[PDB]
RNA sequence: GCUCGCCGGAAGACCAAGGGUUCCUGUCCAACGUUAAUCGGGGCAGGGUGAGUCGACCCCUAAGGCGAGGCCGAAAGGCGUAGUCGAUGGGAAACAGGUUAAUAUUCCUGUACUUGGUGUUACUGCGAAGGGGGGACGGAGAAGGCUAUGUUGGCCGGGCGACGGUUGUCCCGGUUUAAGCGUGUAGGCUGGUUUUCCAGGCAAAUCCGGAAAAUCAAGGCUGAGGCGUGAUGACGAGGCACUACGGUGCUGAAGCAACAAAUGCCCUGCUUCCAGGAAAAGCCUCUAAGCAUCAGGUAACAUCAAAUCGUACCCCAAACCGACACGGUGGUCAGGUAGAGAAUACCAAGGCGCUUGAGAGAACUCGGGUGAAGGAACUAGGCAAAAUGGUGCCGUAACUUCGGGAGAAGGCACGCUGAUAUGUAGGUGAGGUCCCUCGCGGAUGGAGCUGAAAUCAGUCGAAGAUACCAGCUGGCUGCAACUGUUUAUUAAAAACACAGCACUGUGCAAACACGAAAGUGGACGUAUACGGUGUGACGCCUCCCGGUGCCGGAAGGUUAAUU
RNA sequence: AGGACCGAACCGACUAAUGAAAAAUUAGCGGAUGACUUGUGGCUGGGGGUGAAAGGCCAAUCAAACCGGGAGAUAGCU
């Protein structure tokens, strides 16, 4: 049982990319940005409540942040958690 | 028996094996085994404290019974076994109550022989009884110095001790060294000689054999530089000094016994 | 030619890492020294 | 894009470590790239790493570390018990195909497994910080059974030759398929089952151990591979539609047999040797306190569960360690022809041509080739080169520790074709036939397949171990017995070590060594042991105690603190 | 059987000629079942360690490591 507030705080954003689009169209899998602390079950619960849609499963991964250079100064981007959420057959998401 | 090996290679030429067929060809009695890791002759500080130790073969520790307390139960010898931990041979024995123990194999012992500890026990090889019960003039081995402690004298392959006298509460032993020593008459001892007497006839025959026995090579002090050893230095071969340890103490004769607590028990020093 | 530095992360940490420094007095003093200096990387710890 | 060339036990493929975006796409060429650069491991932007079963985490422990109390220590602190950490070792579970520009045992397709809960009905002794078993273990050797894999034939598809020939004993390609489940074989280990008792296993034990007694000779455990299923599937040479020339979608034959065969598996096996070969948990089992008709246990069935972190890329290197796009770096994979071979040569798969080129064709330098006549005259020195080089057979001295020396030396044969023998000796081994406690069985049988070595006859060359590969040999002699070790980076030796010898110490709280100490090593050893010193296989051997040491003695002289 | 033999890997480093290289190259060379070699982790600390002993090695540093401090040591010398 996950608290509603925590659920709301889990999901950061949808991830738009060619691979993501492909996953959406073919495998019925949405690619989300989520809280780095968010576990799989949590993510799933939040999907179910906040997008109102059945989940088969969640795969997660951690994206490491790129090192960049603004002018002369070096600086690193934040790491962030990606989640492939596979949605039950026939589940159409807005 | 001893066996001079044929010289099919140098390093095999001078080899003499000591082969006992009666030893157990098989894995030892595992319950009595336990782990025994190697030191390298280094203490808890991590420093080398005794030179020339190192390496050698992995060895298990057989749990030998030197205290020998199963009084009254007769035991029978199952087999003789190779112990890597000692110059003697060990004997796996079976008490009538079902317990097994390892003991020093005495001279005449073999499979099927019955042995017994206790005051009542019979005065025959392998039997163990207090030295007040043991007749004077007998050879014994695995001798306790303190009652109840466990045998400490005469454990090596072909040793034994002579009870020369029993004077009241003490008996006087003739140690293998030739030292005459008083010992409390209630201390325990095993009849007969310890077994593997032709152990001394073996000759290693090559450097590697010594290494197998965990012995690293020995460098002569005279071969060193002065900063290392008292004997070091000298252009060519020079040795113009009295022999000494690496720590400057005289070596060829100077006595080093300092124990004034046990002086009383030493009847006569060895010669 | 086998050069002196043959990196190994675990070995690095055990030898020089934060907890190692913490464990003993002298290490703690080293840490304090480095803090005083203003070091950004107090220890080898990544 | 077509040729050429190089690697191919790697200069290919996959990992660990280490690195940390170098990966992919677009874009730019100031700087970086030893030149140019449209290119890049460079700049900028965007994208990319998907796990119940892989790894970490986690349970267990080794060396070792920390260490409540504790012991010790001016202080700091040292050692260490109970404990707790510590892999490089032990511990549950997944395979095949398809897919991305870039991930995949992680996505998808199919087919599996695991171990937990929870709920069930069925039953009914469960229970540990404890007992027992197990886990659990060396080197070498030898085979036998296998597979990986390869070759040939068969089959299937395609072909009929840019130049003489090529419808055949011709040419090219393909002929693959997992875990799992069932079977329990080649083979290995062990005698089983029941009953009775017992000073043992810190207590108890129905368990282990030990005694007896009965009865049956088959009982159990283990075990590669094969076979069956998995699979009416997948994949499949290439054909056929579209084409952003990158590719996408449809389609799809055969898919067998024999032989050979590992260093891989059975094998943690067997045989043997001495130098005598981790631990703990998981796992099985036994009970104790307990509880007692509850819980707990096992039984299937249902459901839920498996979190977290890693997953890109390089990884014998241009990405790691070397200041560099400069030698070092552990593991796994191991095709063909020749060959003993993981050597060597040429090749496959795959990957590269080493990030300055173009000319010229002086000296001199480097690395190579050949050389009349001589053949060590060179030189400190045959340094370096040259030479030898294989298999089989013949043959082989002194001396010897009888093992050696010895590959001593020195010689002969060696290609191809035919015949012996349309392919032999051998190896393998199908049908058929017989037996049978019935199977992965046993006999007989020999088809087919493979296949040396030799002899005889012929034949070509200057040359047949034809290339690569591949000992120079002998004689006297010093030193060191020998195999070993050594000055990382001018010394590899006659130096060190060595087995052996001798002396000497040390009676165990050993001597000695590290430690203001506690303690630790010595050693879980005990004089057939340990320490120190010298000598240094083996053979024949091996006067002086005055000096300095050490050992013993203590009559006298001298002699501290103290008084 | 073997600190046995020939010989790749692997470990080394006797001869030779010659910065890509702060010790390498090529051609040869020794060992190659052992006193072998190697990965991972662990322990020994500076008058200390380790040393088959060369004063060798202890982070390209060794007849006393490196870092910081006494410290502006002292310098009848340049």
From Swiss-Prot, chain B:
The keyword DNA-binding does not apply. Pfam families: Ribosomal_L2, Ribosomal_L2_C. PROSITE patterns: RIBOSOMAL_L2. Keywords: Acetylation, Ribonucleoprotein, Ribosomal protein, RNA-binding, rRNA-binding. GO terms for molecular function: RNA binding; rRNA binding; structural constituent of ribosome; transferase activity; zinc ion binding. The modification N6-acetyllysine is found at residue 241. The keyword rRNA-binding applies. Residues 38-47 have a biased composition (Low complexity). InterPro entries: NA-bd_OB-fold (IPR012340), Rib_uL2_dom2 (IPR014722), Ribosomal_uL2 (IPR002171), Ribosomal_uL2_bac/org-type (IPR005880), Ribosomal_uL2_C (IPR022669), Ribosomal_uL2_CS (IPR022671), Ribosomal_uL2_dom3 (IPR014726), Ribosomal_uL2_RNA-bd_dom (IPR022666). Residues 27-52, 220-271 are annotated as: Disordered. Disulfide bonds: none annotated. GO terms for cellular component: cytoplasm; cytosol; cytosolic large ribosomal subunit; DnaA-L2 complex. One of its GO terms (biological process) is cytoplasmic translation. One of the primary rRNA binding proteins. Located near the base of the L1 stalk, it is probably also mobile. Required for association of the 30S and 50S subunits to form the 70S ribosome, for tRNA binding and peptide bond formation. It has been suggested to have peptidyltransferase activity; this is highly controversial. In the E.coli 70S ribosome in the initiation state it has been modeled to make several contacts with the 16S rRNA (forming bridge B7b, PubMed:12809609); these contacts are broken in the model with bound EF-G. This protein can be partially replaced in vivo by its H.marismortui (HmaL2) or human (L8, from the 60S cytoplasmic ribosome) homolog. Belongs to the universal ribosomal protein uL2 family. Part of the 50S ribosomal subunit. Forms a bridge to the 30S subunit in the 70S ribosome, contacting the 16S rRNA. Interacts weakly with S6 in one of the 3.5 A resolved structures. In pull-down experiments interacts with CedA. This is Large ribosomal subunit protein uL2. It comes from Escherichia coli (strain K12). The lineage of its organism: Bacteria, Pseudomonadati, Pseudomonadota, Gammaproteobacteria, Enterobacterales.
UniProtKB/Swiss-Prot annotation, chain C:
The keyword Ribonucleoprotein applies. Keywords: Ribonucleoprotein, Ribosomal protein. It comes from the Bacteria. Gene3D superfamilies: 1.10.287.3980. Signal peptide: none annotated. It holds the Pfam family Ribosomal_L34. One of its GO terms (cellular component) is ribonucleoprotein complex. GO terms for molecular function: structural constituent of ribosome. PANTHER family: LARGE RIBOSOMAL SUBUNIT PROTEIN BL34M, MITOCHONDRIAL RIBOSOMAL PROTEIN 34 FAMILY MEMBER. Belongs to the bacterial ribosomal protein bL34 family. HAMAP family: Ribosomal_bL34 (MF_00391). This is Large ribosomal subunit protein bL34. It comes from Escherichia coli O45:K1 (strain S88 / ExPEC). The gene is rpmH.
């Amino acid at each position: 049982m996950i608290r509603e507030e925590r659920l709301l705080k889990v999901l950061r954003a949808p991830h738009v990319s060619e691979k993501a689009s492909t996953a959406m169209e073919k495998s019925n899998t949405i690619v989300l940005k989520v809280a780095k602390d968010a576990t799989k079950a949590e993510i799933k619960a939040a999907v179910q409540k906040l997008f109102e849609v059945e989940v088969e499963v969640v795969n997660t991964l951690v994206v490491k942040g790129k090192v960049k250079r603004h002018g002369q100064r070096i600086g690193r981007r934040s790491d962030w958690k990606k989640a492939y959420v596979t949605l039950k057959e026939g589940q159409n998401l807005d | 028996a001893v066996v001079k090996c044929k010289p099919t290679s140098p390093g095999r030429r001078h080899v003499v094996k000591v082969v006992n067929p009666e030893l157990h060809k098989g894995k030892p009695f595992a319950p009595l085994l336990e782990k025994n890791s190697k030191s390298g002759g280094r203490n808890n500080n991590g420093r080398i404290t005794t030179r020339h130790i190192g390496g050698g073969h992995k060895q298990a520790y057989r749990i030998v019974d030197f205290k020998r307390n199963k009084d009254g139960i007769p035991a029978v010898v199952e087999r003789l076994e190779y112990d890597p931990n000692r110059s003697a041979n060990i004997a796996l024995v079976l008490y009538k109550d079902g317990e097994r123990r390892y003991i020093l194999a005495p001279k005449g012992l073999k499979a099927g022989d019955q042995i017994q500890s206790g005051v009542d026990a019979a005065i025959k090889p392998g039997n163990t009884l207090p030295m007040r019960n043991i007749p004077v003039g007998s050879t014994v081995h695995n001798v306790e110095m303190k009652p109840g402690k466990g045998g400490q004298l005469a454990r090596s392959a072909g040793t034994y001790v002579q009870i020369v006298a029993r004077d009241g509460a003490y008996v006087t032993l003739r140690l293998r060294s030739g030292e005459m020593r008083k010992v409390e008459a209630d201390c325990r001892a095993t009849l007969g000689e310890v077994g593997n007497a032709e152990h001394m006839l073996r000759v290693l025959g090559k450097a590697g054999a010594a290494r197998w026995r965990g012995v690293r090579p020995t460098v002569r002090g005279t071969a060193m530089n002065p900063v290392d050893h008292p004997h070091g230095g000298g252009e060519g071969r020079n040795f113009g000094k009295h022999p000494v340890t690496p720590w400057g103490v005289q070596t060829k004769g100077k006595k080093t016994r300092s124990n004034k607590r046990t002086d009383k028990f030493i009847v006569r020093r060895r010669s | 030619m086998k050069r002196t530095f043959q990196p190994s992360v675990l070995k690095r940490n055990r030898s020089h890492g934060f907890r190692a420094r913490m464990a003993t007095k002298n290490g703690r003093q080293v840490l304090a020294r480095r803090r005083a200096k203003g070091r950004a990387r107090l220890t080898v710890s990544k």
